[PDB]
């Protein structure tokens, strides 16, 4: 709630950044296979627990 180690804090911060959409300069690339991010977590759906 208020106690999280800094290491456990560094690992949720690395997840708050991974939870951004694919930028719309990626899907005009020549031959990419990416249309969606397909690794977006939602805090309710699935939990990280770390």
């Amino acid at each position: 709630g208020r106690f999280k180690p800094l290491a456990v804090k560094k690992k949720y911060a690395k997840k708050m950044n991974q939870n951004k959409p694919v930028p719309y300069w990626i899907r005009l690339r020549t031959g990419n296979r990416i249309k969606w991010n397909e690794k977006r977590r939602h805090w309710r759906r699935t939990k990280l627990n770390y």
Binding site: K9, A13, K14
Partner: protein
């Protein structure tokens, strides 16, 4: 951060409050000794 300020921006720093943001990035608030105007550094540093 105080030493670094003085080494980079030749201004004094009194209170350096810090915080590790929810991005893993450590912000820093820095009082400039009331003798170095802060609005004369953001205009120098180009903020």
């Amino acid at each position: 951060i105080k030493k670094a300020m003085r080494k980079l921006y030749q201004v004094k720093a009194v209170k350096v409050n810090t915080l590790i943001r929810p991005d893993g990035l450590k912000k820093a608030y820095i009082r400039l000794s009331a003798a170095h105007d802060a609005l004369d550094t953001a205009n120098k540093i180009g903020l």
